[PDB]
Design a protein around this ligand. Structure first.
Ligand SMILES: Nc1ncnc2c1ncn2[C@@H]1O[C@H](COP(=O)(O)OP(=O)(O)OP(=O)(O)O)[C@@H](O)[C@H]1O
Ligand SMILES: [Mg+2]
Ligand SMILES: [Zn+2]
Lengths: 60, 615
DNA sequence: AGCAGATATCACTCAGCACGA
DNA sequence: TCGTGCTGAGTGATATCTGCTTTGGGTGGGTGGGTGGGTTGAGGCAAT
């Protein structure tokens, strides 16, 4: 099948597209909180709610 | 193109270079270890020491297998030997010992795919500089090593800009001078990578000139064969770039002949040597003197006349406490203890400026010296400016003085515009530019040292102090401390002054032997330590300062009832008193401000003006 | 050296006819 | 009404030669302009 690759690299454009779509569809700020070593500041409503889905809805 | 028979055989010299790189020792070979480091991406610059080459030649001669003089060949024509050494290094590059992510690099993938395409075509390439990940430089032959082996070191002998003539072109020479200009670092293209929209192949181009003509048409075998006309498009991702910097080196004052103007020589910096030269530093730049041919119509119109520049290869950079410090400020002058102490207080400039209410008391203990001609005002200015790290000397520059003392000479002669500029510097501690061309505002918390002469040239006792001073009274009031210096004739003082000056003229050294001046380095580092320090004051000292303030205010009002007083004491005098006390506490290295410091500041204030006025 | 205009010599398309099928 | 040449001059096209001009600086000028650059120093003038 035609397979699209960024010139000079071996990264598949399809893989990047699907990864970004998955990240946008399912992501919560609690992951950022745990990454930043601020896990004990996690609440139960905002950090457990989808972030970029809400951003897209507000943008629309 | 008639030929000549020159006594140089590049094959033998290449063999010599390879043997030197492989075998030379000074553990394993030094340059083999360097290449091993380069392979593992640990080093990006290789420097060839001509001393090592000379030692290797001496050893070979001692062993009986006399070889060609490589040092002289390198010195006489260094441009070719750079490429020769690069080729020798490439032919003997050790395999990497530390695994690296090859697939990350774009060039690796592109070359691997080119290899795959070539294999496919065969079943039915790139410039060496493209893959090079290091830079080569030549270190001049040290004079000590040359004298040890009975040889003359032309490369390492310093030369002035004038001594660099046309017969030195193409050689490795050293230049001594002061850098006057350095440009910004910019990317210089060496190899250009193109792409074919139709073919799918990559093309490369080598640039060794000021200008180049880009490719337009594909030259690939496939394209040619198939007759497909494919356009070439530049690709900056796969291209090779090297940091470039252009600098100007000017002659030193002692190198110019009598009745001649200094000259300048261009310098080109490539590779990792970038950022090694800054304006104002005296340097010993070693490089290859080369011409810069023109191109196109300019080439034809110019004629035989050629520009020149230097390819940088190596850069060598040239280099009771209160009383002691005061006396060591300017040993050459006759003892003026109070003025020296005031200069110390200005230099340290200790202060706590953290009001946070919208403004903050000025953190500079400004000093102004006014006196008749004859006092060593210029000497104090020059000395105190030299000691200061940010001291700037100007004649009636502020930006350079930011967060530092400003050394202004001929203060009275200054134009009114500069008077307003310094007024803005004091009251607002800001530098503002309002121009069409540009609009930049730079903060300036800089202290000012001012030297001025009276209105009539010499102080007139009959006239009031304000009359003798041309500057506006507000500027005088804003000055934290004002020192009036006068020359009163006297047998004893004149005799001592004459003896001191005569001894200085004869023996070229300080006449005083009662005490030994403190080393300037110790004094400056002590000043820096004091500046780093932060003092603190209590409530009792605050009440003492308040009492001193009321006493001073009453005394100053009584004095100003007459015309002799310079001016009435004001809250500005207060703030100056606390500033001086904080500076003295910083000097003491004790956090708590003591009553002794306040008393010393008060006596300094009294002796700055009244001591000399009463005389 | 590079660029824009021009000359002239290089092929290729539709045109159509003779034989036989 | 398909296949295979032979004829053919027309309609291209693309591989191929013939003349500027330029940088910048007065070794192109001021009937090409000064808003396309140069350009710091001396000089005369009006408002001050
Ligand atoms: N106390 C002194 N001891 C020795 N030499 C001195 C002293 N005071 C002044 N001089 C000499 O005076 C000479 C001229 O004076 P200087 O330039 O130092 O200051 P100044 O008279 O305040 O200057 P200006 O004439 O520019 O107002 C200097 O060469 C300096 O050597
Ligand atoms: Mg002076
Ligand atoms: Zn191609």
């Amino acid at each position: 099948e035609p397979l699209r690759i960024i010139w000079g690299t071996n990264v598949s454009i399809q893989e990047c597209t699907t990864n970004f779509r998955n990240f946008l569809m399912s992501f919560k700020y609690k992951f950022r909180k745990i990454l930043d070593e601020r896990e004990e500041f996690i609440n139960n409503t905002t950090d457990e709610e989808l972030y970029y889905i809400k951003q897209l809805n507000e943008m629309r | 193109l008639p030929s000549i028979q020159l006594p140089v055989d590049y094959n033998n010299l290449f063999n010599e270079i390879t043997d030197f790189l492989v075998t030379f020792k000074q553990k394993g070979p030094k340059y083999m270890a360097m290449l091993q480091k380069v392979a593992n991406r640990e080093l990006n610059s290789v420097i060839i020491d001509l001393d090592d080459i000379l030692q290797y030649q001496n050893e070979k001669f001692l062993q009986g297998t006399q070889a060609d003089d490589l040092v002289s060949a390198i010195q006489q024509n260094a441009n070719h030997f750079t490429e020769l050494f690069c080729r020798a290094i490439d032919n003997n590059m050790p395999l990497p010992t530390k695994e690296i992510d090859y697939k990350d690099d774009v060039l690796d993938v592109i070359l691997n795919q080119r290899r795959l395409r070539n294999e496919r075509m065969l079943s039915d390439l790139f410039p060496p500089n493209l893959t090079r990940r290091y830079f080569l430089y030549f270190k001049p032959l040290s004079q000590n090593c040359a004298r040890r082996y009975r040889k003359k070191a032309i490369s390492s002998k310093p030369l002035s800009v004038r001594q660099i003539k046309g017969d030195f072109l193409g050689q490795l020479i050293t230049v001594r001078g002061i850098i006057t200009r350095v440009s910004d670092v910019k990317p210089a293209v060496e190899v250009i990578a193109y792409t074919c929209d139709q073919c799918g192949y990559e093309v490369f181009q080598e640039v060794n000139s000021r200008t180049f003509t880009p490719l337009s048409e594909c030259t690939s075998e496939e394209c040619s064969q198939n007759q497909t006309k494919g356009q070439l498009f530049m690709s900056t991702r796969a291209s090779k770039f090297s940091a470039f910097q252009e600098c100007k080196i000017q002659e030193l004052s002692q190198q110019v002949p009598v009745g001649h103007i200094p000259r300048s020589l261009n310098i080109h910096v490539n590779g990792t040597l970038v950022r090694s030269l800054s304006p104002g530093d005296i340097v010993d730049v070693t490089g290859i003197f080369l011409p810069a041919p023109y191109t196109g119509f300019k080439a034809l119109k110019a004629g035989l006349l050629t520009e020149t520049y230097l390819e940088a290869q190596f850069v060598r950079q040239h280099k009771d406490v209160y009383n002691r410090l005061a006396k060591s400020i300017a040993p050459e002058i006759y003892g003026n203890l109070d003025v020296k102490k005031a200069l110390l207080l200005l230099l340290v400039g200790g202060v706590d400026k953290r009001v946070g209410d919208g403004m903050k008391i000025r953190g500079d203990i400004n000093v102004c010296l006014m006196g008749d001609p004859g006092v060593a005002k210029s000497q104090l200015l020059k000395a105190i400016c030299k000691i200061s790290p940010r001291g700037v000397y100007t004649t009636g520059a502020l930006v350079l003085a930011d967060n530092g003392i400003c050394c202004i000479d001929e203060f009275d002669k200054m134009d009114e515009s500069d008077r307003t500029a310094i007024h803005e510097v004091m009251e607002q501690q800001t530098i503002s530019i309002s121009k069409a061309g540009i609009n930049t505002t730079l903060n300036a918390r800089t202290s000012i040292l001012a030297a001025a002469n009276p209105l009539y040239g010499r102080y007139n006792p009959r006239l009031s102090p304000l009359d003798n001073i041309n500057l506006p009274a507000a500027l005088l009031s804003r000055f934290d401390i004002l020192f009036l210096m006068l020359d009163i004739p006297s047998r004893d003082d004149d005799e001592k002054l004459a003896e001191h000056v005569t001894y200085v003229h004869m023996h070229n050294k300080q006449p005083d032997l009662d005490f030994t001046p403190v080393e300037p380095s110790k004094m400056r580092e002590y000043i820096a330590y004091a500046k780093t320090k932060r003092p603190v004051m209590s409530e009792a000292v605050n009440d003492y300062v308040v009492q001193a303030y009321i006493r001073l205010r009453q005394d100053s009002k009584r004095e100003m009832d007459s015309k002799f007083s310079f001016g009435q004491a004001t809250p500005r005098t207060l703030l100056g008193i606390i500033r001086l006390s904080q500076a003295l506490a910083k000097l003491r290295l004790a956090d708590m401000v003591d009553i002794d410091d306040v008393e010393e500041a008060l006596r300094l204030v009294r002796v700055s003006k009244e001591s000399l006025y009463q005389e």
